[PDB]
Design a protein around this ligand. Sequence first.
Ligand SMILES: O=C(O)CCCCCOc1ccccc1CN(Cc1ccccc1)C(=O)c1ccc(-c2ccoc2)cc1
Ligand SMILES: CCCCCCCO[C@@H]1O[C@H](CO)[C@@H](O)[C@H](O)[C@H]1O
Length: 257
Amino acid sequence: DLKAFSKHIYNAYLKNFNMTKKKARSILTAPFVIHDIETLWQAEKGLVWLVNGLPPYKEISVHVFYRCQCTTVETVRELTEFAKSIPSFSSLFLNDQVTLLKYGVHEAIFAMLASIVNKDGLLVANGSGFVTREFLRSLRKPFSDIIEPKFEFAVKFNALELDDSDLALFIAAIILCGDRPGLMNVPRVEAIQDTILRALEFHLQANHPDAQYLFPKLLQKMADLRQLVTEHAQMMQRIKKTETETSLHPLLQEIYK
Ligand SMILES: O=C(O)CCCCCOc1ccccc1CN(Cc1ccccc1)C(=O)c1ccc(-c2ccoc2)cc1
Ligand SMILES: CCCCCCCO[C@@H]1O[C@H](CO)[C@@H](O)[C@H](O)[C@H]1O
């Protein structure tokens, strides 16, 4: 029954997300490279890319920041459907579901989208483009500061060489976390989390027989993710207060409220 539990989560993962890690890493090993202002313009013109649907133009750094919001908001949508495809998550009261998503999605995003990252940059536009790390570093503060930490985490995370089956359970564990503030039914969520963590350890034993310390290594990554997101939240607060011309998607406003 724990097998059926784990297999259901994996199916939900495949159904609700666009690109698997399998696809992502095969591409990275060709997409149009965005490495400067000109190539960014060319990408927006047709070689890669809802530019007309974005907020009014302000500047290059802010424009990229808007493209960042596009992807995260899209990933939150997918994560929500993925979570809702899990029976134990859907059996929670709706307000608890929102609490878990609110405090869980960014942890899940940074872990899950590590797949589309290497040391040189990351995939964009469903894998049609590749934006260099150097270009993102070249953006002005605070936009370059909010980006770089994710690369450091991603490359270290990708070194564990998880596959999509591992990630499905790992992301589920992140969302179903009993530590989120304001949770109504903590014991129920804690119990679900424990079950997923048990399923994960069991899965890792079979899928990575030679991989020692892999499960405790992943528990440490969950701790790292909490720190990453906390720092990220702090930087988003700085942008909210100091970048008046920079708008924020309403959904993200609610998350950082
Ligand atoms: O708080 C929020 O949700 C919105 C505020 C996010 C601000 C920080 O966003 C990023 C920071 C570091 C890396 C990547 C991203 C954004 N992401 C998600 C991500 C996150 C972590 C790992 C991997 C992918 C992107 O996928 C991405 C999309 C488009 C571009 C782009 C377009 C044209 O030029 C550049 C660049 C990146
Ligand atoms: C779509 C799933 C992800 C949604 C994440 C956004 C959650 O925002 C929160 O929504 C609650 C209303 O339900 C409010 O009470 C909180 O003040 C607000 O912060």
